[PDB]
Amino acid sequence: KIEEGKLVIWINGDKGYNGLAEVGKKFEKDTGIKVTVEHPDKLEEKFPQVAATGDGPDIIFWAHDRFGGYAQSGLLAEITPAAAFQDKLYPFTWDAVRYNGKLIAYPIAVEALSLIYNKDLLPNPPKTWEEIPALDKELKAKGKSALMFNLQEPYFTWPLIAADGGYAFKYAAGKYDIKDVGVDNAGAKAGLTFLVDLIKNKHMNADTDYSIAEAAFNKGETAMTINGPWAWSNIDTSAVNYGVTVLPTFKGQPSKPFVGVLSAGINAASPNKELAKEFLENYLLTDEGLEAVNKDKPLGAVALKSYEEELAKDPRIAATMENAQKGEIMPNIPQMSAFWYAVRTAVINAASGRQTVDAALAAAQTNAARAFAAAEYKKILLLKGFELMDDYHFTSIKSLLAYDLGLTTKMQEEYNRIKITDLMEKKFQGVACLDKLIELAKDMPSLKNLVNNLRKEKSKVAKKIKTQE
Ligand SMILES: OC[C@H]1O[C@H](O[C@H]2[C@H](O)[C@@H](O)[C@@H](O)O[C@@H]2CO)[C@H](O)[C@@H](O)[C@@H]1O
């Protein structure tokens, strides 16, 4: 149901989608192929849901960390550029889009967070995180604040969590150990404790989000923010004179941002794969194509060598790359989505006071390190739960799940057992989806045997996890 003879492109709303649309208009004039750029609200999650049914955009843009999961799910076409084209982009950017030996997207640009500071409020910005409480107290006396940044997305807190030792999945001997997670080690706990202490002491508010922090910095209300290159053009438009610099150190160690490569994947369901390749290789990944996007919202350090030679002269790009070199390339492994979910929960719960730092990170550690087992829990839920109950009992469960899963009346009537299994596991990660069905079915007498077996399947998996760990 993707239309043949047209290109639909999805890219996140913080990127230069109007510039990308200009590249699309040029393509349409040359080829007669309409190009429509959209930026739907929850892109990285709408795509895997609609693409799994054969729908969605021809081309999907996101940082490379989500792409290995998309590839494992059969959502992406293999990328096979000629050697001459491969030579046009930096090898480490191709590495970010290589998964299981094959290229699964075109790399576009390299993103890392930097410290952005107001040069008039703060000519000499702090070198350490530890200086920020005293700096905030100074600025509060002048009706200003020291620092505001998005606390709702763990991407922005990760550099501080990683500074003294936190890590996602351990990398050694050229491979990631998806069972060695570094979310609850001493360094991670120290970094998140520092952040939570900033909030407890009223140097930041737990509810600060992207929009609040951007407006506060761009209006001159806060002296510093933490953001990526896409944010610079809105600061240019503002009255604020800003610098982009190395992130503060923590316990004398650099902040370690997770480095993202904005990447463009081709939907395996697209009937326009040849046109998508033409657009990406010969329109976007040219000096003129990247310039059109970059002039809208800066891309960062682009993957195209010819254009990066120009951008590298910008001290904001030098600062981006200095922070990138102190950080780490994100894994692209399929477990990244579950890792980010677990860490998002931990940061939000610790910052808001719903959990201590220790308990929040302990749970995130467990959740991320058991993410490998998510497919097996889903299989148990589908094969030993839903497929073993008649339509009547399935409908009753759908009724009980409707509030939490957002099921309308039509959805309750039409959704099959596979769709419900998928929705449940997204809402109740891993083992929680199986616990949920047990909880709902425990008091239906005709499902007594079904529930008994679900409990044994649940223990059986926990045993295999306890054996393999
Ligand atoms: O916060 C978790 C989130 O982090 C990264 O998302 C970044 C993205 O890479 C940036 O380009 C920009 O859009 O900010 C996002 C954070 O809000 C990961 O790429 C993403 O998968 C993950 O969920």
Q: Give, in order, the Cα–Cα distances in Å from 189 to each of 185, 196, 350, 354.
A: 6, 10, 11, 16
81 φ, ψ (degrees, to nearest 5):
-80, 150
User: Where is the chain broken, named by the residue before each break, C–N > 2.5 Å?
Assistant: none
Contact 160, 188 (CB under 8 A): no
Please indicate whether residue 217, judged by its CB atom, sits closer than 6 Å to ligand 1: no
Q: Rounded to an integer, what distance in angstroms lies between the CA atom of residue 323 and that of residue 325?
A: 5
Contact 430, 371 (CB under 8 A): yes
Q: What determination technique applies here? A: X-ray
Kindly report the CATH number assigned to the domain that includes residue 415.
Answer: 1.10.533.10
Residue ID of nearest Cα to ligand 1 atom 17: 153
Residue ID of nearest Cα to ligand 1 atom 5: 155
76 φ, ψ (degrees, to nearest 5):
-125, 145
Q: Answer left, alpha or beta for residue 110, where phi above 0 means left and psi between -120 and 50 means alpha.
A: beta
Residue ID of nearest Cα to ligand 1 atom 7: 155
For ligand 1, pick from 14, 114, 153, 337 the residue to mutate: most ligand atoms within 8 Å of CB: 153
Q: Answer left, alpha or beta for residue 256, where phi above 0 means left and psi between -120 and 50 means alpha.
A: beta
Please indicate whether residue 12, judged by its CB atom, sits closer than 6 Å to ligand 1: yes
Task: Name the nearest CA neighbour of 458 among 387, 376, 393.
Answer: 376
Tokens 């050229």, residue?
174
Residue 155 one-letter amino acid: Y
First to last CA, the chain: 44
Q: How far is the CA of 11 from the centre of ligand 1 (A)?
A: 12
Q: Which domain does 400 fall in, by range?
A: 371-468
Q: Which atom of ligand 1 is nearest to the CA of 210?
A: 17
For ligand 1, pick from 15, 47, 155 the residue to mutate: most ligand atoms within 8 Å of CB: 155
Please indicate whether residue 339, judged by its CB atom, sits closer than 6 Å to ligand 1: no
Q: How far is the CA of 153 from the centre of ligand 1 (A)?
A: 7
117 φ, ψ (degrees, to nearest 5):
-135, 150
Q: How far is the CA of 155 from the centre of ligand 1 (A)?
A: 6
Q: How far is the CA of 64 from the centre of ligand 1 (A)?
A: 10
Q: How far is the CA of 467 from the centre of ligand 1 (A)?
A: 34
Q: Rounded to an integer, what distance in angstroms lies between the CA atom of residue 327 and that of residue 244?
A: 16
Q: How far is the CA of 330 from the centre of ligand 1 (A)?
A: 10
Give the sheet arrangement for strand 145-147, strand by strand: 145-147, 222-227, 114-118, 242-245
User: Tokens for 196?
Assistant: 């939570």
Contact 444, 393 (CB under 8 A): yes
Pairing of strands 6-10, 102-103: unpaired
User: Tokens for 156?
Assistant: 């922005």
Angle 112-115-116 from CA coordinates, rounded to 5°: 110
Which residues are CB-neighbours of 83 under 8 A, at least 6 positions away? none
Residue ID of nearest Cα to ligand 1 atom 22: 340
DSSP state of 230: G
Residue 185 one-letter amino acid: N
Q: Give, in order, the Cα–Cα distances in Å from 423 to each of 257, 271, 391, 392, 402.
A: 31, 28, 18, 19, 11
Tokens 């729908």, residue?
55
Contact 125, 224 (CB under 8 A): yes
Please indicate whether residue 39, judged by its CB atom, sits closer than 6 Å to ligand 1: no
